[PDB]
Design an enzyme around this catalytic site. Structure first.
Site, mmCIF file in Angstrom:
data_model
loop_
_atom_site.group_PDB
_atom_site.id
_atom_site.type_symbol
_atom_site.label_atom_id
_atom_site.label_comp_id
_atom_site.label_asym_id
_atom_site.label_seq_id
_atom_site.Cartn_x
_atom_site.Cartn_y
_atom_site.Cartn_z
ATOM 1 N N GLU A 1 -10.198 -21.957 -3.928
ATOM 2 C CA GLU A 1 -8.814 -21.888 -3.580
ATOM 3 C C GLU A 1 -8.421 -20.548 -2.942
ATOM 4 O O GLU A 1 -7.360 -20.468 -2.391
ATOM 5 C CB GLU A 1 -7.935 -22.158 -4.822
ATOM 6 N N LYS B 1 -6.583 -38.065 3.047
ATOM 7 C CA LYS B 1 -7.415 -37.725 4.200
ATOM 8 C C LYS B 1 -7.966 -36.292 4.100
ATOM 9 O O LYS B 1 -8.810 -35.895 4.895
ATOM 10 C CB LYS B 1 -6.636 -37.950 5.526
ATOM 11 N N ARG C 1 -13.148 -32.692 0.987
ATOM 12 C CA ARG C 1 -13.687 -31.802 0.013
ATOM 13 C C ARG C 1 -15.189 -31.997 -0.045
ATOM 14 O O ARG C 1 -15.713 -33.022 0.354
ATOM 15 C CB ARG C 1 -13.086 -32.068 -1.373
ATOM 16 N N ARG D 1 -12.212 -28.101 3.038
ATOM 17 C CA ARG D 1 -12.614 -27.055 2.147
ATOM 18 C C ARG D 1 -14.128 -27.152 2.000
ATOM 19 O O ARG D 1 -14.671 -27.607 0.978
ATOM 20 C CB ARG D 1 -11.894 -27.138 0.813
ATOM 21 N N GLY E 1 -2.350 -40.402 1.992
ATOM 22 C CA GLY E 1 -3.462 -41.226 2.470
ATOM 23 C C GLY E 1 -4.822 -40.708 2.013
ATOM 24 O O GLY E 1 -5.827 -41.380 2.209
#
Lengths: 291, 330, 291, 330, 330
Positions: free
Chosen positions: D119, D217, D220, D292, D215
């Site tokens: 994060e 989308k 990860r 990410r 949704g």
């Protein structure tokens, strides 16, 4: 032909001098901050811009090098990775001068490792720099013999002399264009990493000849091969091999001979801890050794 | 009577704990970071193991001082090379951390039985070192070996001052080369076992040479732990309160030997031992404070004590136990 | 003739070698822990006991030296006081090798101070060691010229060469006995102390020639002469003197010329702070200088 | 090598402890307020359970830092709703209490292995988040979800500063959705297990719907704990001291999926599972930082590491263990 | 109303103190380690000089917080080179020591008026930096110039949290290049005066060159201290309590110039000045965050304020006073 050079140490100095003698225009020299010659001083004296960033693998340096528009790039004992984004800037390619008979002894400190391993020969190799470090095709390779009494410093001077001889003819050859290079056979390659203090630790169960080679490999001005008398570190600066006792035990104190796994090692000179260098017999007394 | 031993996991802790548990009116609180040296008392109803470290703990030690009646702080580094190699740590542990424990006793009005050291006399020229009359002699500040001696002496003076000014009940004791079974390891920070005999026995066990520093003509006195611990036990008992504010050498002044002679005695006892063949040949004597004999009048007076074991029986018993408990696979 | 020697640096090494070549028996060498030769390594290699106590002016060392029974004592660039209680142990006396034309330049760093002061000559002197440091009678003195382009290192090699020449003939002469020595005239003596970093600070109000001499006096491998651009330190490694502006102001940046109290000083090579050495023109840009 | 794990009673604690106990030269001190997640190591000779809570204890944790060699602080709240519902407590625990532990390491010159967070990169636009080069992007102060990201980042900077100025030996690591057996509970204040897969598996287990926020989308990366723990183990080993002062993303960048796709993968593995019939029918997908992906060059360089387990085997193994250990009566 | 100014011996302290002493209901407590910048108020009945240093004093500052009603902490290092040359000291003073003062206000329920910085926005791409809506953009951790920006921002967030959770009454203000008479010295650790104009005026005064970093095309806004101090004075007055919990940019967004243009304006005003001949010839422009314009809607709303002085009058007045007070013998 214009070039950007990465260089350090005596090899770096002689490589720069050879490029200059061969008519190359050196736009910039990349080196490192610190008994050998200073590439920075040589550059400063010759009026060649010189940079010593800790790491060039960043766009800031790629752009600075791109602006210099090198036709060719040379690495002469530069110690850090020069990534491909930089090396690809030179249309004629990038060439590295390595102190061993590549593909043997790729990697770090080939000068010392060939002595550690008791090689009877080594050499200098000028090769193309490809993605894989020290694996590019060979432009030329020049062999030198390693004499039984060579130590790191005497072998270093022989390697530098060979490098001068090799570069004197190959640099002009490169200036004329691509040379048919000799591929390295991966199955014959060997690679060594940077030597740690542990790599110069003498283990008496080994053959005296192997320990003797270790002493030769890191003799002054290198750090020296070392061992301990109990908890006291000592360094063996010079030794001699001799032809029935526990390894590591003292056979005699004058001369100072230590029993090895095979044969004995005479400690000709050495020091206790950070003390001064002395003859083995004196070192024996200093360390409290007795037969 | 709740007896708090700080640094119980060693020679004195073992022998003292054995002695006090024979008697029906002792509860022993043995503080340490390990228990291997005393593991056979862990199940005893009147022994209480206490986890601790006098450099780390504040409140936990303080608590145990309050809970208990008498306190014996045995944690100190007395390894000579350490006086010069790690002087600050010797000072911090031996002086500063023990001073905290002293102040806990002052605060909770507890009795302290403190191991001073025979090293306090230093180069005193009296033939018999006398707790009440002998001058203390050390070298200049440029001779750092004396940092241990002088740290311990200043601690004695601070104890003395708390006694005078703040009603601290204390007895100071000075052991002279106590020896027997279950010797401390050479680098354990616990007071009590003769480092000279442990080293020598170690030489024989390892097959290393016996170092005679300048011929080993310096003379020392050696004391069987049965004699020593008997004295310490009487200090704890404190019949008539006769130990209050006293400084007591505990040694056997007739067990005098140079390091050379101690060497030969050990070697004779060694060569004669049935387990000698598990150990290497003798590596030999190696030539590389001249006297340290205690006055024991204070121990005579306060404890009605005198040593009963001759040199030869203590040597033999000490060596015998050491050899028998050596782990021959390690 | 047996001797105890106090020695360090190249002068120490050559003095030991000269004593050995002259047939002296060196019982022990006293030196110091640390580009020059190592007296300790030379001693260790020749099997001569060697000690490096920080201070010998204590009875422990007087007694150790007395036990060695030297006939004569030599000091070859040893850096510390050797008090009389030690020197008097040698019946034939004690002799010191000093790098200047004594009585001028007694004291520390005569190699550098003669360059700082723009001397056109210097030399080596072997003299008897008396109570007063560097003031004893002269056994022999050999002069060398200082060339306008000499810097500390080139002058150092010339001094060592002169020392070798001087010792080669004087050591055997001493072995034959007392030599009629030449008294130093105190009224002609000058003495210098150890140089501080401040002693190599360039002050631009001075004549360019004086500053140029300072640059020469501490050129590499010495620390270098330095100044500041505001709050930024820089070192001038090499310079040139040139024949109407505030002192310290920039006359030109390529070549980099700085106005002095008289004349101008060109900074041929130098570095900014602990950065690498570069040509003056590049250094000018690095320091943000403009005409 | 004494390894101090603060917050051992969880996913990383379990898997790390297993790994270190395989090797013969580790003593694991596992600090926590409970032991149910690791109860099978309680009897292991080289595991040492330590009672504690990093918000309550000062001296006890400090002690254990001094006693040990390397420290892994795994206590933190990383539950997104908590960033907005209980921001002060997230700050106090994750920042302030961990800062105390950092300062204990500085003081006793111990090595710290600290879980930074993925994060920290926030809305970084690089495709591969690079520990040494990527800019960190957060929203305004009026977007309080970023308090967790920025607290963790400031802690990294403080560690970095102690390293530069005070010789602290550290390695920082950033896990990217580690997953496998023995996942932390969703509201346990212990770092390490992918909250996204735990939630989804929980949806299937409970028969609640899978929420696709806009949704689902957002993409990860997911990392098998066998890969992750291998990397962390190498950071502990620290061959050549190559991890000193380093920041290391630990994830598998080829295991990329949107929440939607992760959803479908889990559901497929679920519907195929022999114990699926103990769980309710699928309640369905419910429509309610866009990428990410880690750079892993630092892990390649320092650890010689690269991830070996494909998406499908990690998904299957993670789900399988979860289902098998669910208590069906509760 | 007792107003406590910490770091009074400077630009803001001077101009603020003048303003508050015009009004009959202010007692000004001016804390500092010197008084040369404000020596003409030392005899004023409603000014009270307080000896102090926020890094050394604990209790003395705490006392003065309790004694007073409102607090203005102006001590901070905002010298850019220092962010990279002495980052730890910038952090310690600007963050840690100011945090103590914040906590004193929280504890004694006092109002704090805190100088945040325009540097908090960083590389924000909005044309007008908005306290309530603009995202804050900084570089990676390997760009250490951002340590000042991020320290100040975290301090804002901590103030905000005390406000939310602990009822702290605060207003935050962000000055944009305030300028006028009695500028701080370039290396004084006191907030408030435009370092860019002080540097440039210094170049002209010293005859050094004006550095245009990359051509000096980066644009800044400049604010006359009469406008700035009027705003700050209204924050102190706090009509209707309309400044409670507010963050207020104080600058003049119409006074926009690149460093190049600011350069030329100063030079024109300089060459025209009757005392110009006491200063050296112009050494010239030397080629060696691209915009930083404040939104001032919050100041419009809360303070009913808008800036009244044009660029040229502020430039002229600032330069004129500087030149006139330069000591020509030193």
């Amino acid at each position: 032909m214009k070039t950007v050079v990465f260089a350090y140490h005596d090899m770096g100095c002689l490589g720069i001098e050879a490029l200059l003698a061969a008519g190359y225009e050196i736009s910039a020299i990349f080196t490192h901050t610190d008994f050998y010659g200073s590439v920075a001083r040589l550059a400063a004296e010759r009026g060649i811009p010189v940079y010593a960033p800790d790491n060039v693998n960043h766009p800031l340096w790629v752009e600075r090098i791109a602006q210099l528009s090198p036709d060719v790039i040379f690495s002469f004992y530069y110690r850090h990775l020069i990534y491909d984004e930089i090396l690809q800037l030179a249309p004629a390619g990038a060439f590295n001068l390595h102190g061993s008979l590549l593909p043997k002894y790729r990697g770090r400190a080939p000068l010392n490792w060939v002595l550690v391993n008791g090689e009877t020969e080594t050499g200098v190799t000028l090769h193309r720099m490809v993605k894989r470090a020290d694996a590019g095709a060979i432009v030329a390779q020049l062999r030198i013999a390693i004499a039984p009494d060579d130590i790191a410093i005497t072998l270093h001077h022989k390697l530098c002399h060979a490098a001068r001889q090799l570069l004197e003819q190959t640099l002009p050859a490169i200036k004329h264009g691509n040379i048919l290079e000799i591929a390295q056979r991966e199955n014959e390659a060997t690679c060594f990493g940077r030597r740690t203090p542990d790599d110069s630790f003498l283990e008496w169960h080994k053959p005296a000849s192997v320990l003797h080679n270790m002493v030769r490999a890191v003799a002054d001005p290198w750090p020296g091969a070392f061992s301990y008398v109990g908890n006291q570190k000592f360094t063996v600066w010079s030794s001699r091999v001799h032809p029935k006792a526990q390894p590591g035990s003292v056979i005699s104190v004058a001369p100072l001979l230590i029993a090895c796994g095979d044969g004995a090692l005479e400690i000709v000179t050495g020091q206790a801890g950070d003390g001064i260098t002395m003859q083995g017999s004196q070192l024996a007394q200093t360390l409290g050794l007795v037969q | 009577m709740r007896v708090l031993i700080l640094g119980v996991n060693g020679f004195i802790g073992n022998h003292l704990t054995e002695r006090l548990l024979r008697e029906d009116h002792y509860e022993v609180y043995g503080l340490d970071i390990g228990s291997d040296a005393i593991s056979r008392f862990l199940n005893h109803p009147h022994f209480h193991f206490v986890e601790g470290d006098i450099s780390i703990h504040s409140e936990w030690i303080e608590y145990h001082v309050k809970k208990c009646d008498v306190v014996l702080p045995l944690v100190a580094i007395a390894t000579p090379i350490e006086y010069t190699r790690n002087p600050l740590r010797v000072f911090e542990l031996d002086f500063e951390e023990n001073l905290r424990i002293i102040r806990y006793c002052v605060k909770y009005r507890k009795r302290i039985i403190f191991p001073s050291t025979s090293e306090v006399y230093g180069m005193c020229s009296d033939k018999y070192f006398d707790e009440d009359h002998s001058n203390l002699i050390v070298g200049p500040v440029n001779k750092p070996r004396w940092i241990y001696s002088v740290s311990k002496q200043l601690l004695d003076r601070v104890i003395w001052a708390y006694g005078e000014k703040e009603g601290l009940q204390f007895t100071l004791f000075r052991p002279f080369n106590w020896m027997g079974p279950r010797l401390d390891n050479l680098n354990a920070a616990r007071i009590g076992s003769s480092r000279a005999i442990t080293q020598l026995i170690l030489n024989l066990v390892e097959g290393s040479p016996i170092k005679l520093i300048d011929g080993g003509k310096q003379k020392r006195c050696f004391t069987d732990i049965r004699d020593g611990i008997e004295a310490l036990y009487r200090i704890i008992e404190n019949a008539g309160n006769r130990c209050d504010g006293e400084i007591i050498n505990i040694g056997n002044p007739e067990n005098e030997a140079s390091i050379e002679e101690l060497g030969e005695m050990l070697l004779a006892s060694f060569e004669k031992h049935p387990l000698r063949h598990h150990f290497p040949p003798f590596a030999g004597f190696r030539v590389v404070v001249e006297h340290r004999k205690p006055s024991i009048r204070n121990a005579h007076r306060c404890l009605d004590w005198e040593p009963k074991i001759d040199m030869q029986e203590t040597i033999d018993e000490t060596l015998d136990f050491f050899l028998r408990t050596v782990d021959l696979t390690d």
